[PDB]
């Protein structure tokens, strides 16, 4: 066996930026990794393809995954509406960390965030489940379209996504 690899082809107002690939830590957080994997292939009939990164804060993170309401109040998991925090084994140690956004204890859905810096104050509150494997330069380019309060200057969308491995 081996951990799954998923990719996102990022676009800015429709123009292709590039591909970001992530390794999902299925060995430590199997349920959380599977949720993200399935949402990336779209195999349950809904998923990330075509959704946007609605909140980008330079020097902090890029947030996305709201494919239902597209504004941060929506989205859902492949297990129903929301699911528990699997475990807090992994930490937000640096840029490239993939972690679950939430609304408090045990409220994981589909929203996630890619760290562009170490964000240790989120340790034990947000479930870390993967990391950027390739394309960190693409995430950095995305960061340039963010702002202090999170509002993006241009539309950053997941033009395509799926599983590589």
């Amino acid at each position: 066996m081996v951990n799954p690899t998923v990719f996102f082809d990022i676009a800015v107002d429709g123009e292709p930026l590039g591909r970001v690939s992530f390794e999902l830590f299925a060995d430590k957080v199997p349920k959380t990794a599977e949720n993200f994997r399935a949402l990336s292939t779209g195999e349950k009939g809904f998923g990330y393809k075509g959704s946007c990164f609605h909140r980008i804060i330079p020097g902090f993170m890029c947030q996305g995954g709201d494919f239902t309401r597209h504004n941060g109040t929506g989205g859902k998991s492949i297990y129903g509406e929301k699911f528990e925090d699997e475990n807090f084994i992994l930490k937000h140690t640096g840029p490239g960390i993939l972690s679950m956004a939430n609304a408090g204890p045990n409220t994981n859905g589909s929203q996630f965030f890619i760290c562009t810096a170490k964000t240790e104050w989120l340790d034990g509150k947000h479930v870390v489940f993967g990391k950027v494997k390739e394309g960190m330069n693409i995430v950095e380019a995305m960061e340039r379209f963010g702002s202090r309060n999170g509002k993006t200057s241009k539309k950053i969308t997941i033009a395509d996504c799926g599983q590589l491995e």
């Binding site: 902090f60 947030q63 941060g72 972690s99 939430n102 609304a103 965030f113 964000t119 989120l122």
Partner: peptide, 11 residues
């Protein structure tokens, strides 16, 4: 604040 919530944004 620098939080990543889904719904009600805090400080």
């Amino acid at each position: 604040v620098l939080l990543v919530t889904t719904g009600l944004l805090l400080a």
